[PDB]
Amino acid sequence: YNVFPRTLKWSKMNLTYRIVNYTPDMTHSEVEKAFKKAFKVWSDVTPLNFTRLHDGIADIMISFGIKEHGDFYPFDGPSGLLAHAFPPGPNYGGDAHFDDDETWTSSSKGYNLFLVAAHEFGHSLGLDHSKDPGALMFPIYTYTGKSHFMLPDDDVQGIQSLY
Numbered sequence: 665y666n667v668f669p670r671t672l673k674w675s676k677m678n679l680t681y682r683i684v685n686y687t688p689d690m691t692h693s694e695v696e697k698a699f700k701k702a703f704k705v706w707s708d709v710t711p712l713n714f715t716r717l718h719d720g721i722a723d724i725m726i727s728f729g730i731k732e733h734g735d736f737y738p739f740d741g742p743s744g745l746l747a748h749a750f751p752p753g754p755n756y757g758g759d760a761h762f763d764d765d766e767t768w769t770s771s772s773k774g775y776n777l778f779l780v781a782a783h784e785f786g787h788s789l790g791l792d793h794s795k796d797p798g799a800l801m802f803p804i805y806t807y808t809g810k811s812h813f814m815l816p817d818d819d820v821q822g823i824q825s826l827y
């Protein structure tokens with residue numbers, strides 16, 4: 665016989681993702697680079713690797729939508745909820761949805777896609793929100809406007825307790 669695991673995490677180290685569709689705000693290329701950067705944040709601090717699929721069912725299905733888009737987490741227009749993700753598991757587990765009523769950018773303007781993706785992929789991997797306002801996993805977007813991105817220690821300890 666078998667039993668479910670308590671503590672949601674991936675048991676396999678090589679995960680796949682697929683970008684199902686694209687925001688108008690950025691180039692296909694800029695969106696691909698952003699999500700790849702966001703996965704590299706996590707592969708640099710864990711044994712996980714992330715490979716991209718062009719078709720088929722991937723472990724992490726990435727899409728953009730507005731308002732009601734096919735689950736119980738409807739978006740709400742500009743600002744408010746930026747994105748959400750499902751925790752690790754079969755079916756919809758790992759999927760990351762981005763609100764296409766945001767202005768997505770590769771900069772300090774609007775919402776930085778890489779940054780929000782880094783955060784949501786945290787949920788995809790099994791991290792919940794942090795109480796530390798400096799944390800990547802803090803529930804509220806707060807662009808620090810530093811030159812380069814550094815994963816704060818709070819999120820390193822969290823991810824290391826899982827993987």
Ligand SMILES: O=C(O)c1ccc(Cn2nnc(-c3ccnc(C(=O)NCc4cccc(F)c4)c3)n2)cc1
Nearest residue numbers: 779780783799800804805806807808809810812813
């Ligand atoms: O390569 C890039 O595009 C790039 C470079 C540098 C920085 C510098 N930086 N600005 N803000 C942060 C930073 C570092 C850690 N956490 C947050 C943050 O805002 N966390 C909460 C959050 C993030 C995303 C969505 C969300 F709901 C909550 C922001 N780092 C950001 C992005």
Ligand SMILES: [Ca+2]
Nearest residue numbers: 723755756757
């Ligand atoms: Ca999935």
Ligand SMILES: [Ca+2]
Nearest residue numbers: 741743745763
């Ligand atoms: Ca929104």
Ligand SMILES: [Ca+2]
Nearest residue numbers: 689764765766
């Ligand atoms: Ca948009």
Ligand SMILES: [Zn+2]
Nearest residue numbers: 733735737761
């Ligand atoms: Zn959704």
Ligand SMILES: [Zn+2]
Nearest residue numbers: 783787793803
């Ligand atoms: Zn979150």
